[PDB]
Design a protein around this ligand. Structure first.
Ligand code: C1Y
Ligand code: C1Y
Lengths: 229, 229
């Protein structure tokens, strides 16, 4: 009966969970709304953070430090880099980096600042739980590296560069920051993304067309994981 | 009295305060150390966050949500954009933006995400307090706009662009994120920076030469502000 945080970046990523849960209580905090529900005897706290690294860092910190979350599941969409990924495919992050954290003028690798590492890992036990849920429900699930930064990527050259440097399978704007917070606060973290676009030419149009559906796929999956916790 | 958080990004920005305080208690939390001291009968919490937006967001969130800080003073160094600023000069931020928060592909202004604003303001009463301290101690103090992002700027073209878009007087990697956290959590925030470099060609060398001294200037000033709180 651990307290579980479920976090997305946008309303579209969390609204499907709220509609499935049906009954919940709202609390205004940190210029946002935090939702509280009981799901199959688990206390849940849910929110969308708003877009980007700072917003998602704040929400993760609030869910743990203020509301006492003991596990955090992130659900949302992402831009696909690995050519085997199609729109709608699920990817969980084994590790994540910030591609736009840059003090390389002083000789450091891209994504590195003193005191930290380039990559942050997610929780092994949660990742193994996800694999058993995927097997149980006959859902295709890929493991990979996610590159996080505060830009919407819609450029083939930029995509290729980030993929080359970090061996990244997808990009988004919240994962590495959320995973960093959870690691710092000793909370098991799981980062799941469904592909909404391929992060190249006209990715903005694919995102618009597929965000609602891809968000539902990821949302469903994390709610099934809550059952096995 | 109110509980005061004093936050920097690097050891160089906070160590001068610790040496002045002499006596304090260290607590390991959020993969970092938080320092607790009494200064002229004011309860302080101090830390350096480590570099960048995510790290500084986390520390500000911890200081407020976990440790109950009621006011937050940020102290450190910055890269000067306004040509009237010289190395060592003090600038407090009236407002701040994230120059590298970019969903402009969907038509939004640079620095904007839905639910937030382009600029975040600092606390008027703290800024006026700083002006009285500057007058009292005969210290030159300038007000300006600070642009925040996760890159060390050492490029005249980048400097010119950020200055043009945001009317920014200086740049750094933590201010807008810290100010955003404080605003979200209803905590008065003050952001003070002493110039370490001019953010152009060979800014890395100027930073190295002047960081220790510039950091001490900012650190001294925020400690004097604590006396008037
Ligand atoms: C408004 C769009 C930005 C949302 C969607 N989300 C994930 C994402 C999907 N496709 C992406 C791409 N091509 N680049 C970056 N990130 C993403 C990150 C922000 O919360
Ligand atoms: C590795 C050094 C970067 C430190 C110093 N700090 C302020 C700063 C001074 N000069 C700057 C410039 N030209 N660009 C960005 N930021 C800065 C931001 C990071 O915490």
């Amino acid at each position: 009966g651990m307290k579980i945080a479920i976090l997305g970046a946008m309303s579209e990523e969390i609204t499907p969970l709220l509609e499935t849960l049906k009954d919940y209580t709202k609390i205004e905090h940190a210029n946002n709304t935090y939702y509280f529900a009981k799901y199959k005897d688990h206390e849940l706290v849910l929110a969308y953070s708003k877009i980007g690294k700072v917003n998602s860092t704040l929400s993760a910190s609030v869910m743990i430090e203020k509301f006492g979350a003991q596990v955090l599941l992130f659900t949302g969409v992402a831009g696909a880099f690995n050519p085997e990924l199609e729109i709608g495919d699920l990817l969980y992050a084994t590790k994540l980096a910030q591609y736009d954290l840059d003090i390389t003028a002083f000789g450091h690798p891209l994504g590195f600042v003193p005191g930290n590492e380039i990559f942050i890992k997610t929780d092994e036990k949660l990742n193994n739980l996800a694999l058993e849920v995927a097997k149980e429900l006959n859902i295709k699930l890929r493991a990979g590296i996610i590159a996080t930064g505060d830009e919407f990527i819609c450029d083939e050259a930029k995509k290729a560069k980030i993929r080359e440097i970090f061996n990244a399978d997808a990009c988004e704007m919240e994962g590495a920051s959320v995973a960093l917070v959870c690691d710092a606060l000793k909370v098991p973290c799981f980062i799941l993304r469904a592909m909404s676009d391929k992060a190249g030419e006209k990715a903005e149009f694919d995102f618009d067309e597929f965000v609602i559906n891809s968000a539902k796929i990821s949302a469903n999956f994390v709610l099934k994981m809550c059952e096995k916790l």
